[PDB]
Ligand binder design. Structure first.
Ligand SMILES: [Mg+2]
Ligand SMILES: [Mg+2]
Ligand SMILES: [Mg+2]
Ligand SMILES: [Mg+2]
Ligand SMILES: [Mg+2]
Ligand SMILES: [Mg+2]
Ligand SMILES: [Mg+2]
Ligand SMILES: [Mg+2]
Ligand SMILES: [Mg+2]
Ligand SMILES: [Mg+2]
Ligand SMILES: [Mg+2]
Ligand SMILES: [Mg+2]
Ligand SMILES: [Mg+2]
Ligand SMILES: [Mg+2]
Ligand SMILES: [Mg+2]
Ligand SMILES: [Mg+2]
Ligand SMILES: [Mg+2]
Ligand SMILES: [Mg+2]
Ligand SMILES: [Mg+2]
Ligand SMILES: [Mg+2]
Ligand SMILES: [Mg+2]
Ligand SMILES: [Mg+2]
Ligand SMILES: [Mg+2]
Ligand SMILES: [Mg+2]
Ligand SMILES: [Mg+2]
Ligand SMILES: [Mg+2]
Ligand SMILES: [Mg+2]
Ligand SMILES: [Mg+2]
Ligand SMILES: [Mg+2]
Ligand SMILES: [Mg+2]
Ligand SMILES: [Mg+2]
Ligand SMILES: [Mg+2]
Ligand SMILES: [Mg+2]
Ligand SMILES: [Mg+2]
Ligand SMILES: [Mg+2]
Ligand SMILES: [Mg+2]
Ligand SMILES: [Mg+2]
Ligand SMILES: [Mg+2]
Ligand SMILES: [Mg+2]
Ligand SMILES: [Mg+2]
Ligand SMILES: [Mg+2]
Ligand SMILES: [Mg+2]
Ligand SMILES: [Mg+2]
Ligand SMILES: [Mg+2]
Ligand SMILES: [Mg+2]
Ligand SMILES: [Mg+2]
Ligand SMILES: [Mg+2]
Ligand SMILES: [Mg+2]
Ligand SMILES: [Mg+2]
Lengths: 271, 46, 93
RNA sequence: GCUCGCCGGAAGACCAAGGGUUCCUGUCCAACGUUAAUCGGGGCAGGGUGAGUCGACCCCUAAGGCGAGGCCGAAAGGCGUAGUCGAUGGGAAACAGGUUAAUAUUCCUGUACUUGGUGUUACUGCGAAGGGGGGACGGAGAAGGCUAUGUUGGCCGGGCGACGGUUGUCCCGGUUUAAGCGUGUAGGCUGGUUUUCCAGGCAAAUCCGGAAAAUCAAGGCUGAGGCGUGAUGACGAGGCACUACGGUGCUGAAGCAACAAAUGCCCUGCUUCCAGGAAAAGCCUCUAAGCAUCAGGUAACAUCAAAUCGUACCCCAAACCGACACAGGUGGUCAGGUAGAGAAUACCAAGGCGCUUGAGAGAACUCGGGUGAAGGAACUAGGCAAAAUGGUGCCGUAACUUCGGGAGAAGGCACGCUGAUAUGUAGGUGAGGUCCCUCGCGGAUGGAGCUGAAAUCAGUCGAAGAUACCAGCUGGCUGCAACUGUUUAUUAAAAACACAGCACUGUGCAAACACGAAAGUGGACGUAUACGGUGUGACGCCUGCCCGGUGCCGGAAGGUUAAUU
RNA sequence: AGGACCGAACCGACUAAUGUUGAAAAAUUAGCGGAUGACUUGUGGCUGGGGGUGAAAGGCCAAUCAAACCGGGAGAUAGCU
């Protein structure tokens, strides 16, 4: 659950940990791992294209199945595991034919449970169906947007998508952001919310904790010189400007979405 | 006091060596300039 | 097999010094100057053919030349190769 | 040559980087050396670096580089696929002794090991650019078992002391031995074996994964150290003869035990935590095409091969980076004694040095120190500087508090040596003996010997017993910043920056955003519990009114309005 | 357990004195801060000049930085000395 640390040092006073007794303690499944080196925010030109990224603990990549297309073969959950690469927990499932895969662990899924994908699967958490067959009002996760492409929506811990209507070839979803969207009825969705809903309750407690996750310090613009940021300069603390990004674009309210290719699928903006 | 020149043969050769010069058009221009000038040693490689 | 004239060219001169004399009297080794590009096998064959003496092994080292001075012009002597070849304990050139 | 002093976790000894002959010998003293110089890292000549096992090279990959085609770009070029490079990482193998003026795991002596090619014999299903296993991996912590190593005893050799004593419970020295081979131990991990079946591993597979049944539950893997051998050897104090005074030839005693003990090894182990901890080959195994009593594979034996390059010397420095023989800088390894917690510190060992100008004198003044009557911050911008405090054990300790702290609060007492308790205790270690068994590096019992605190009581010396070196000044009130951190390399370390936390706002994924004429790339192999931007800055109580101005968001009736016509 | 505590190596650089044609173009001596971590360090790699990088001082980018260095336009221009 959520555990408060004892204030035995200044850096511990505010730490809140999220501890799961049911996660595996051993090493992960070796055949489903590969390296991923860190970028530091640098692109192939070598330049910082995203600031505030660097360092952190080494991690290995767990190949997760977002497609779930081993159709019609029941599988049993072996163990829940810790994944460095995401907020959610992953679950190691064993297929009846001897194949092992990692999937996003939904809420309430424990070891020994039975999951299955396909058009004929039952309505149970962890089961994957084309959204044609899922009743309206169901809450799914790991939702696809193009058939056969892989789930892309509602993948972070505690997130899910509401199926609010089906009309012909399209189903209407309600995303966590509050946006109503249309997707083709043949895209697949996994039933139930994704687990580890306490992830948002953690408190890092100290600066080093954020440095462990690869986050570097953020320098305020108003603390720079004019040559470095539109906010720089001043004798003392001076602002007298409309807030903007480091590149001069207004940054409190100005909308930046510009994609006409996709405006047809948006029913309502997140408001 | 730590001074600016910290010798390292590998880095010297990789940054200023003959083959690093021949890699780029500008490097060949450097070599052509130094041949025209008449330099006894074209590069650090020597 | 190594062709004849390569054998005739690999050997240059016998090395004369007191360490060489000590080696001759103690371990039946002869020390001699060889081509800068000769190999242990080629020295093997050439000493066995041009002195009619059989040998156990060959040890080689390359001597770096000395930087010297001749009226303030600097000049470097050339590197050469030295061979320690051990005769087979019964021949005594 | 004798004596004196200094370092000794270095100012000793190896190596990497870097340098390149500075290394050793002979000779010279013009210049160089902050002086002289017979000397030298100086001049001149000669000599010196020996590898199947060390390193490179080589096989394999990381970050990253280059990149056939390709995509993109006025040109130049940019990115990138297949590939190919790239160690700071993974991959076979050697030790001890001797020897030169200068090299040595390279030479010699002795004893080993590795890989590969051939040939013979015997038996055989061999085969990959493919499948599977393995290689293969974090931080912290704890303990047990060991060794390096040290001390003491025993043993051997020598000694009997310049001045009182010293045949003894006395003094000095030595008491060493490797890889390999055999043994498989302390200990760690793991149930094993045989059938049958199978939507999996791009095809196949007897291999891996999965399912069921039967049977036995002891098999397997890993593993320091010890012991035996290596070793009837080598080494060995010290003797005997030359000395050409450097040292050279012959001989060679003892060569045991107990205790203590690592930061090293078992240990890539075990326990635990979250921040969840490289890759690929070598290696093992499976088959595909294919071949088919050929080839190939396994085993034994014989034989051949293991090339090329580095190897001198300095290496916390007079040889590297600093213009200098420059109080500077420079990664790794080794790690003795006494006291001590200790790699601090003091004095020493091995070892290495006295820092390349001296000789006098004993003024002011400057620098670095010692002491000081009475007073004790009166000094001064300011207790700046100095003085002072300082250890271990035990007693005791306030406001306030986020209940952890504050706190080593403050303050106090004891502290040496000798004897006894106890001819050395509690404890630790542990031989002999005994008794067993599946017999062994075995189990139980026994306790010799060795080592050995702490305490109490009594005495005793001094002015002083934490005696030196070493080693907190303490308390009260208050501003600012919550805190650990970071910064103006070279006048500013702070109240500045960051920070966990908070809020606003953008972003529905071909995301926003950023680099880029573009292709692409980062964000992210992430998906709104996510990512970017902005402000504020732990925590507690909170965060009031104004939308007139300037922004931003929404609206789209009306007015005005571009190219166009 | 810990961006826990005391303290060497190690990394820094708060005070004072010396030095200031220095032993040294930033040090020495005595004290001082951190010392299991937002730590420190070796080796290699990447980012290039109106560009980089910056826990932000206009700091740093080879003793050079409110726009590096080298070469060129170039004998810039100079009502000024
Ligand atoms: Mg950011
Ligand atoms: Mg922030
Ligand atoms: Mg500022
Ligand atoms: Mg501006
Ligand atoms: Mg003001
Ligand atoms: Mg104002
Ligand atoms: Mg001393
Ligand atoms: Mg010379
Ligand atoms: Mg010399
Ligand atoms: Mg002189
Ligand atoms: Mg003279
Ligand atoms: Mg000389
Ligand atoms: Mg060689
Ligand atoms: Mg040999
Ligand atoms: Mg690559
Ligand atoms: Mg390329
Ligand atoms: Mg091309
Ligand atoms: Mg390669
Ligand atoms: Mg390497
Ligand atoms: Mg030597
Ligand atoms: Mg021992
Ligand atoms: Mg050497
Ligand atoms: Mg000197
Ligand atoms: Mg020096
Ligand atoms: Mg150092
Ligand atoms: Mg010391
Ligand atoms: Mg005086
Ligand atoms: Mg005094
Ligand atoms: Mg006085
Ligand atoms: Mg007095
Ligand atoms: Mg006063
Ligand atoms: Mg006054
Ligand atoms: Mg003071
Ligand atoms: Mg003092
Ligand atoms: Mg005030
Ligand atoms: Mg502060
Ligand atoms: Mg601080
Ligand atoms: Mg600093
Ligand atoms: Mg400064
Ligand atoms: Mg300062
Ligand atoms: Mg602020
Ligand atoms: Mg600390
Ligand atoms: Mg100091
Ligand atoms: Mg400390
Ligand atoms: Mg300023
Ligand atoms: Mg500079
Ligand atoms: Mg300019
Ligand atoms: Mg002009
Ligand atoms: Mg001019």
């Amino acid at each position: 659950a959520v555990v408060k640390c004892k204030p035995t040092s200044p850096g511990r006073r505010h730490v809140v940990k999220v501890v799961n007794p049911e996660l595996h303690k051993g090493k992960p499944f070796a055949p489903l791992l590969e390296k991923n080196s860190k970028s530091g925010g640098r692109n192939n030109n070598g330049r910082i294209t995203t600031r505030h990224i660097g360092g952190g603990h080494k991690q290995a990549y767990r190949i997760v199945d977002f497609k779930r297309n081993k159709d019609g073969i029941p599988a049993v959950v072996e163990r829940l595991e810790y994944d460095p690469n995401r907020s959610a927990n992953i679950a190691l499932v064993l297929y009846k034919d001897g194949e092992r895969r990692y999937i996003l662990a939904p809420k309430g899924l424990k070891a020994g449970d039975q999951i299955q994908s396909g058009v004929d699967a039952a309505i149970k958490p962890g089961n994957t169906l084309p959204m044609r067959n899922i009743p309206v009002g169901s809450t799914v996760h790991n939702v696809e947007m193009k058939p056969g492409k892989g789930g892309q929506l509602a993948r972070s811990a505690g997130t899910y998508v509401q199926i609010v209507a089906r009309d012909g070839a399209y189903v209407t979803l309600r995303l966590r952001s509050g946006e109503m969207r249309k997707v083709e009825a043949d895209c697949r969705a996994t039933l139930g919310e994704v687990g580890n809903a306490e992830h948002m309750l953690r408190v890092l407690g100290k600066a080093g904790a954020a440095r462990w996750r690869g986050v570097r310090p953020t320098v305020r613009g108003t603390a720079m010189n004019p040559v470095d940021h539109p906010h720089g300069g001043g004798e003392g603390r001076n602002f007298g400007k409309h807030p903007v990004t480091p590149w001069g674009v207004q940054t409190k309210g100005k909308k930046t979405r510009s994609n006409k290719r996709t405006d047809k699928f948006i029913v309502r903006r997140r408001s | 006091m730590k001074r600016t020149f910290q010798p390292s043969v590998l880095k010297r050769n990789r940054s200023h060596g003959f083959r690093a010069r021949m890699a780029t058009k500008n490097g060949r221009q450097v070599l052509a300039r130094r041949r025209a000038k008449g330099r006894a040693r074209l590069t650090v490689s020597k | 097999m190594i062709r004849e004239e390569r054998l005739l060219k690999v050997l240059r001169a016998p090395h004369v010094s007191e360490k060489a004399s000590t080696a001759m009297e103690k371990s039946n080794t002869i020390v001699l100057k060889v081509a800068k590009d000769a190999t242990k096998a080629e020295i093997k064959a050439a000493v066995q053919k041009l002195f009619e003496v059989e040998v156990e092994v060959v040890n080689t080292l390359v001597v770096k030349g000395k930087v010297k001075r001749h009226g303030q012009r600097i000049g470097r002597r050339s590197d050469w190769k030295k061979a320690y070849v051990t005769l087979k304990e019964g021949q005594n050139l």
